[PDB]
Amino acid sequence: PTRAQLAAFVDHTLLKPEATAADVAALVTEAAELGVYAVCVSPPMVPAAVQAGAGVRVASVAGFPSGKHVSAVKAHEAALAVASGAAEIDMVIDVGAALAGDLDGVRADIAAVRGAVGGAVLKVIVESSALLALADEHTLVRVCRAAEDAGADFVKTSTGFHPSGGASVRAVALMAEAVGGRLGVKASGGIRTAADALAMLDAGATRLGLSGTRAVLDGL
Amino acid sequence: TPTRAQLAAFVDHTLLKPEATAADVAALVTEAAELGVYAVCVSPPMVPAAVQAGVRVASVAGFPSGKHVSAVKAHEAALAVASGAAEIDMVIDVGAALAGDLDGVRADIAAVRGAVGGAVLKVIVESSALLALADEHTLVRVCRAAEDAGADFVKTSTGFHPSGGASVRAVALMAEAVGGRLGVKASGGIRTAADALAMLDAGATRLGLSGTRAVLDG
Amino acid sequence: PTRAQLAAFVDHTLLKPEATAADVAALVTEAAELGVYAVCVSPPMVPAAVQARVASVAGFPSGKHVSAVKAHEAALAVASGAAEIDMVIDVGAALAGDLDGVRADIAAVRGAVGGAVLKVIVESSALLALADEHTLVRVCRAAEDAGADFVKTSTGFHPSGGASVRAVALMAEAVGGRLGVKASGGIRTAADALAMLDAGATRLGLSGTRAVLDGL
Amino acid sequence: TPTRAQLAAFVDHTLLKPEATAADVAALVTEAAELGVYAVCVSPPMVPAAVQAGARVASVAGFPSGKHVSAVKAHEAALAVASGAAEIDMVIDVGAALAGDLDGVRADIAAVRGAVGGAVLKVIVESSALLALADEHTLVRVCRAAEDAGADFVKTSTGFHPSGGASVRAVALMAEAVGGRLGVKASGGIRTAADALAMLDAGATRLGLSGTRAVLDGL
Ligand SMILES: [Cl-]
């Protein structure tokens, strides 16, 4: 698995609240030098990301990181991001809604954002480490099926901000089996080495969210 | 030094975890009425069931990252107020402030001010990030911008940023910057009575607490 | 009915695109002199009405806005102090038979205004002219299903016209005693007013209220 | 004097009735392609089905009244563009223009501009109202506000205001004020091929029509 090949799986990411336009400009330069698939930035940073290169593939987050926004608000955010040049959107579910068993609500929340972006690649962050710690494997699968039923293109493990943690190979395996190659699976959160990255791919991930991409690639 | 009832009267009793359910919020409301606190603070989608649960309600906007365009923060804040929130605690774009874009921070806060009508508007400045990454003057500038944009409070912290939560130095700087014309809400990591009293003595006029019972027993 | 009793049914209304803050202030002054129930103004004028009981409109007059936008608009008005919101349905949605869509559109606004009085403009003159009585009734029931407090006849801007006695009578028969019924559009005389109240209206939307009251 | 295909290329083929259905919109799109128009113009909730109809889509914002706070207009514009609209035709608050609050009109336009990114933004000044209720200089000031706020076009009318729609005089004034830096769209009550060509001769670079076929047949 080559350095260029692993890099083609990667969304090179900066989501810190303190991030400046200059930070986002350096992120895009580093992404181009590394040969990654996209940059992932916070919604108001999309103009800066688009302006920092030619033909930059930009993903933005929506309803992030808490998931605790009403659906209209997540949709509005996603639509402004697409209007500013975002090709993809990584939204967060209402994690508390999943845990209460309101799967209809989770599915409708994702369908609202789906209807607003239209053209864009939509990834749904299920916060798998939170679902697996506070409920069970079954709950994770149900959330994945809601994402599929609502028209999502990816299910995605983690925000990288929840204290329960990030991607596990078990979560990815569970998520990959549930969507069965019909949707992509993005592993994210705490992927810090080459070995972490390869193990997520081996478990079924078809995309990786990384902030320390160079160090991951250097490990090869 | 204040009694239990007096300390409680300073408090916004808070649950903002991503995993919070309606049942968690209903238990939070019941516990706030027992403790005699000033308000509950809940996430925007939980406002209707907090309000209906029979307590003054605050909500958050652009929370916790602050990385949302103004129009998204304003839309969120309008919905929460229309659903019955009495107060909104919004987060600034911390990066905008670090880059020196103080007119943009102010316009961001003005958009929210215009959406909430007469509701109490608190601006979370993420003081521990501003003091870690810039300097005292930058914290003062952000506060003044909040007052210029029509805020009613300046507020230290989200409780979610790794730079930490409320500090005495941050609270005192903020209280001087607003000169008693706005409130100062100290929040994030306030776990004991001594923490609480240290912030009120530094000039806080409201406290954001998640573990209020343990502070009150104090 | 006395002058005072008839006024008590009225939402005293200015919705013209050219309306200024000064026009809105004269409308409120006139409202309070006439003893009306409420003033009805356009969403950006709500702050000036409140600072001078206020109803505002939402998704008005076309009804052609996505649900989230109507809900955003309604919430902003309530936040600036509107006690009531009068929204417009996607009339074309109702005519295509998409009553689930119309209901969902109304429930979105319902969930965004909290405790506000929510009135749903069904554009009854268009529904009767382009569909049928049964469609008008189905739209009213969707409004009830979605949690609305009132059904209302007309924007006063649709070419098909305004309130008719039959539309109001149908709407009152269908949801009367459970939802209020507001007759609006083309109510120009005392006799028009009284004919809508007799048909089952419990609120009236008027622009020329003084003239209507004078005819008693 | 333009050929049929040339006149058609100036046209936004439009359906904005409250009663319009998805089926009405799909017929509109089919007719648009047949006629060779520049674009179809539809109401915001109709954009996704107009885009999916698979042959350029414009939508409107804060239409037709202009009486919506800026944030609502901007929200509405964003959604339409995210659903594939290439252009947005917004409506100013006409009463704000009349009250002399041109800074507020400018800010209202700037709000929509920052929501749409790169889309073509047209600003509807409701010229027939500005001329009937104010004066010519007010029309010019509103055009300047639009330019200053980053609009790509100024545009006469909604076609729903009782003071009427496009006039030769309105179009000449607007085209003078923007001086070829913005486009000028003539719209509202353009009933004949003669009406259309008089607007074009007055400086319009785009035409909003509903009865497009009957206009083109007049050539
Ligand atoms: Cl002619």
Domain that holds residue B170: 1-218
Bridge partners for C142 per DSSP: none
CA distance A81 to chain D (A): 8
The residues near B182 (Cβ < 8 Å, ≥ 6 apart) are: B146, B147, B151, B152, B153, B154
Output the CA–CA distances (angstroms, integers) from residue A32 to A36, C62, D7, in the order listed. Answer: 7, 47, 46
Contact C72 A72 (CB under 8 A): yes
**Residues B12, B108, B152, B185: which is the catalytic one?**
B185
Instruction: Please answer whether residues B153 and B182 qualify as being in contact, where contact means their C-beta atoms are separated by less than 8 angstroms.
Output: yes
Please, what sign has the CA dihedral across residues B207, B211, B214, B216?
positive
Distance (Å, rounded) from C-alpha C40 to C-alpha C59? 14
Among candidate residues C130, C140, C142, C119, the one with its CA nearest the CA of residue C59: C119
Other CB atoms within 10 A of residue C202 CB: 16
Residues in B whose CB is inside 8 Å of some CB of D read: 71, 74-75, 78, 111, 114-115
User: Which chains have at least 3 CB atom pairs separated by less than 8 Å from chain B?
Assistant: A, C, D
Distance (Å, rounded) from C-alpha C150 to C-alpha C175? 9
Estimate to the nearest angstrom the gap between the alpha carbon of B174 and the chain centroid: 13
The residues near A63 (Cβ < 8 Å, ≥ 6 apart) are: A69, A73, A74, A77, A91, A92, A113
Among candidate residues A219, A174, A179, A178, the one with its CA nearest the CA of residue A200: A174
Residues in D whose CB is inside 8 Å of some CB of B read: 71, 74-75, 111, 115
In the numeric block, which tokens belong to residue D201? 């001769």
As a three-state string, the secondary structure of chain A is: CCHHHHHCCEEEECCCCCCCHHHHHHHHHHHHHHCCCEEEECHHHHHHHHHCCCCCCEEEEECCCCCCCCHHHHHHHHHHHHHCCCCEEEEECCHHHHHCCCHHHHHHHHHHHHHHHCCCEEEEECCHHHHHHHCCHHHHHHHHHHHHHCCCCEEECCCCCCCCCCCCHHHHHHHHHHHCCCCEEEEECCCCCHHHHHHHHHCCCCEEEECCHHHHHHCC
Contact C72 B79 (CB under 8 A): yes
Among candidate residues A110, A80, A78, A77, the one with its CA nearest the CA of residue A94: A110
Output the CA–CA distances (angstroms, integers) from residue D64 to A63, B138, B215, C157, D201, in the order listed. Answer: 32, 45, 56, 11, 26
How many domains in chain A? 1
In the numeric block, which tokens belong to residue D86? 């290439």
Bridge partners for A125 per DSSP: A92, A156
Distance (Å, rounded) from C-alpha C216 to C-alpha D179? 57
Closest chain D residue to C46, measured at CA: D69
Residue B105, helix vs strand vs coil: helix
CA distance D52 to chain B (A): 27
Contact A84 D117 (CB under 8 A): yes
Looking up residue A7, the CATH number of its domain turns out to be 3.20.20.70
Contact A80 B63 (CB under 8 A): no
Output the CA–CA distances (angstroms, integers) from residue B200 to B165, B196, B203, B205, in the order listed. Answer: 15, 6, 5, 6
Resolution for this PDB entry, in angstroms: 2.2
Distance (Å, rounded) from C-alpha D216 to C-alpha D3? 9
Contact A83 D116 (CB under 8 A): yes
Closest chain B residue to D115, measured at CA: B71
Distance (Å, rounded) from C-alpha D203 to C-alpha A42? 43
Bridge partners for C179 per DSSP: none
Distance D35 CA to ligand 1 centre (A): 21
Instruction: Please answer whether residues A49 and A56 qualify as being in contact, where contact means their C-beta atoms are separated by less than 8 angstroms.
Output: yes
User: Which chains have at least 3 CB atom pairs separated by less than 8 Å from chain D?
Assistant: A, B, C
Distance (Å, rounded) from C-alpha A102 to C-alpha D87? 38
Contact A65 B68 (CB under 8 A): no
Q: Are strands B11-14 and B39-42 parallel, antiparallel or unpaired?
A: parallel
Instruction: Please answer whether residues B106 and B78 qualify as being in contact, where contact means their C-beta atoms are separated by less than 8 angstroms.
Output: no
Q: Token match 């739209």: residue?
A: C139
Distance D205 CA to ligand 1 centre (A): 19
Residues in chain D within 8 Å Cβ distance of C40: none
Residues in A whose CB is inside 8 Å of some CB of B read: 15-23, 42-45, 64-70, 72-73, 76-77, 80, 92, 94-97, 99-100, 127, 130, 134, 161-162
Among candidate residues B62, D46, D74, C68, the one with its CA nearest the CA of residue A111: C68
- Residue A158: phi and psi, rounded to 5, are -150, 155
Distance (Å, rounded) from C-alpha D61 to C-alpha D51? 17
Q: Which method, experimentally, gave rise to this model?
A: X-ray
Q: What angle do CA C6, C8, C9 make, to 5 degrees?
A: 75
**Residues B12, B73, B108, B155: which is the catalytic one?**
B155
Contact B19 A77 (CB under 8 A): no
Among candidate residues C81, C88, C80, C82, the one with its CA nearest the CA of residue C58: C88
CA distance D71 to chain B (A): 7
**Residues D89, D93, D108, D195: which is the catalytic one?**
D89
Residues in chain D within 8 Å Cβ distance of A80: 78, 82, 115
Contact C81 B117 (CB under 8 A): yes
In the residue annotation, D155 being an active-site residue is answered as: yes
